[PDB]
Amino acid sequence: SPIEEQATRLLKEVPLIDGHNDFPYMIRGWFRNDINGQDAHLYDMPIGQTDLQRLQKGLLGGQFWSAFVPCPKNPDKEVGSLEALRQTLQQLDVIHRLIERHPTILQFADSAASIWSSFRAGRVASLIGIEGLHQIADSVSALRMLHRLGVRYVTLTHNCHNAFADAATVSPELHGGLSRKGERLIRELNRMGMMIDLSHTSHEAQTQALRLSRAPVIYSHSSIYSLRAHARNVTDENLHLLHRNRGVVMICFLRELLASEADQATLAHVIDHIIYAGTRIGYEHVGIGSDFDGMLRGPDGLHDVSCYPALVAGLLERGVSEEDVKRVMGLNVIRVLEEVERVAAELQGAGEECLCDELDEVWNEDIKEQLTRERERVRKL
Amino acid sequence: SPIEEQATRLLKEVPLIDGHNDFPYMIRGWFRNDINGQDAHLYDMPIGQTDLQRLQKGLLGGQFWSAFVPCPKNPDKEVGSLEALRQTLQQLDVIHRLIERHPTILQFADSAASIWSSFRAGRVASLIGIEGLHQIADSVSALRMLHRLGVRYVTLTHNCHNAFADAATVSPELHGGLSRKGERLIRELNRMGMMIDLSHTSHEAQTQALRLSRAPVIYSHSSIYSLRAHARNVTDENLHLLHRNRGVVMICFLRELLASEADQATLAHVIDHIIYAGTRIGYEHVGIGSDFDGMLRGPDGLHDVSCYPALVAGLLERGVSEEDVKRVMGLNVIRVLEEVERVAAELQGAGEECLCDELDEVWNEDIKEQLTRERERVRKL
Ligand SMILES: [Cl-]
Ligand SMILES: [Cl-]
Ligand SMILES: [Cl-]
Ligand SMILES: [Cl-]
Ligand SMILES: [Cl-]
Ligand SMILES: [Cl-]
Ligand SMILES: [Mn+2]
Ligand SMILES: [Mn+2]
Ligand SMILES: [Mn+2]
Ligand SMILES: [Mn+2]
């Protein structure tokens, strides 16, 4: 078919970069992060919507792999919060090991340049995002270390309120958008060069974040509220504020977010959502954010990671231009990452102060006096 | 003076690389890791044996900065262990910020090549080590992420027994050397390319580690048992096993480890310890491991980081050759790091299996059956 031949050409010319895939959590569920001698299964998985053979088959150019861990359920909130931090390091560890053990397929990327170099070499650009600020255990120091471990976006919440922002699905509201700590964290996220992800956050938290952020943000996996009213989808108000922000809405394949009856959801519905956003806020502010492996079953025609060529072909069939399809595929999210890094370099170049954690005093006045007395003795020498 | 002129030449030709300095913990004590607008104090500190002016003055070529946090004291052992992990990320964070905010003085290094490039550029090669396996919260995943954050040695214990090994200063013995987990961790440390540090560990733990390790190890800050009997010093038995291991003993300036009466300890005593080791196991297996800022007061003549030229001059005065002084200064620890990286590349190249954490099951049989049923449905399409 001419249209399928065109879709294949686009997928080789420009990387399709998906905003969110939970394959690392499936590895934790199935293998418990022990992938030694499991290549036969990693290439052909007995569960889930992602494996390394189907990943090649769908011609995906890049992927933000999710380092998600669940919201803490422990009655002791200090334990649960700290447990989430350790689990985050476990998920970052298995992602890095997955990439390093399969270097012909996957190549780690943390920038626009590293995405392109991976794509030129014929590998899936493998980026990392965490899904919720519960994962950092109220530590901005930990967050900067997660950035150093390769995390390039942070979803502000998952399905739980945290100290920084409100989640969409939980009620009643705690902060009513962002907290004062949340507002201050937006500045730090912009300064360090971390992409803000507004998926899973409340409508009011999106509005506040979209006005406050000095860099473009993303929705890593959210769809359109006007087509399907859901707390997880993006309102027309926030779509416009995303345009002013210069951000990108990466459209989700979650059936609940595409149709009132989940079993009615299709590839056509995903294309409707992409075209709605592209028509109203321009095709330079729309992306693809599957949420593959964050669901049991996908829409008809988008059952797994092998189905991306049907999405590219489907967009071309509806009359979206090649250049606009290339934008939706990956150029837009590359631009956002590039601009986030530019803003960070600008703010770091200007010598902006970093956000520090509130630490306990480890020395009393007796120890501090001993140290100052000792220093003075050394000055006498 | 001719000898001081010779010492200055050696310090410009070859980097003096110190094995252990706790300046990052002094920053946590004094500033609580908030160094914004504190450059005047960071260059001229009101406390401690390290600041950026005195660091330049002593002509130090490189430094393993300690990311130490105390042994957990919480009655709830799960909380205390997880707290230590978060505190470790705080200390790694402040070390990276200290380096990044002072790029004319400090440059991050994690390899032999990066040490030399830093030294050619006229900067202190800034490496990182953690002091105790209590810092990883029983997580090998976390340990691999610490390696990715720039940690290049791990002291197996501090002043507390952990799940892997026995500390020197604590009695009674728990494991009687290394545990079974400890033995297995030695293989993983060798595989990932992490230097094993045997300072603070028991004599029996040293003996077992020195026989088991496939890469050379270090003592980041330990002195000689035969000259001064202390649990923290290295016995003649372990000195010989260090020779077979190809490791390096980096001699400590702790007054308690140099003399029976601490107030009698001197620069001359440090030189006696270096010459003892150099005479008996060769000058290619001896280094300098101050432990500056791990003590209130240092020996007479080694009061702070500005005093390294007196140590180099003192060694030359005693009849140690230029080439052997250059070895003790830094070439030896560079060799150990280089060999640790070579062994890791060899084992990783051969496809050796990594040590994985014991994780809980997150899915029950009902969820796993749903996933396999779903996968089969996709295979039918
Ligand atoms: Cl290009
Ligand atoms: Cl699921
Ligand atoms: Cl704290
Ligand atoms: Cl060289
Ligand atoms: Cl102290
Ligand atoms: Cl666990
Ligand atoms: Mn997810
Ligand atoms: Mn999600
Ligand atoms: Mn120390
Ligand atoms: Mn110590």
UniProtKB/Swiss-Prot annotation, chains A, B:
Note whether Metal-binding occurs among the keywords. Answer: yes
Residues annotated for substrate binding in this entry: H158, R232, D291
Pfam short name (any one): Peptidase_M19
Q: Which pathway or pathways does this protein act in?
A: Mycotoxin biosynthesis
Does Cell membrane count among this protein's keywords? no
Q: Which residues cross the membrane?
A: none
What S-S linkages are listed for this chain? C71-C160
Cite the EC number. Answer: 3.4.13.19
PROSITE patterns, sorted: RENAL_DIPEPTIDASE_2 (PS51365)
User: Its family?
Assistant: Belongs to the metallo-dependent hydrolases superfamily. Peptidase M19 family.
Q: What is this protein called?
A: Dipeptidase gliJ
Organism encoding this protein: Aspergillus fumigatus (strain ATCC MYA-4609 / CBS 101355 / FGSC A1100 / Af293)
> Which gene is this protein's source?
gliJ
